[PDB]
Nucleic acid binder design. Sequence first.
RNA 1: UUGCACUACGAGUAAAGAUGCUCGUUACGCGCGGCAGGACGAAAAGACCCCGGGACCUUCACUACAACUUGGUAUUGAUGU
Length: 47
Amino acid sequence: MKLILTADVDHLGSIGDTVEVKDGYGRNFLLPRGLAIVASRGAQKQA
RNA sequence: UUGCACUACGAGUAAAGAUGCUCGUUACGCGCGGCAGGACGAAAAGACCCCGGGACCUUCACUACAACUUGGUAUUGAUGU
């Protein structure tokens, strides 16, 4: 699943390349950091 | 407690231990005080024995489950050799 970063991280990468999260490592780590989104209407606001 | 009733004894007979059957013997009728041999005395659908049901108990019986433990996957992530 691709998603929409805010800061460059050694797993996720840039903002908008190809996201390969580990299934929980996002909402327990990333989404508290305010650096990642579970994509709902984000594949075009990313643009 | 109670099927009766005017409820003898013997030797027998009978479900094998007779107040009631048989053959005899012995007893006027009723009553009150005693004993307690019998009435398979009363009580208590024998406690024992055996059959049938149940009960609880045990366990190198049966099958379950609890509980204790084993891993599998979800919550469970990163970076690294």
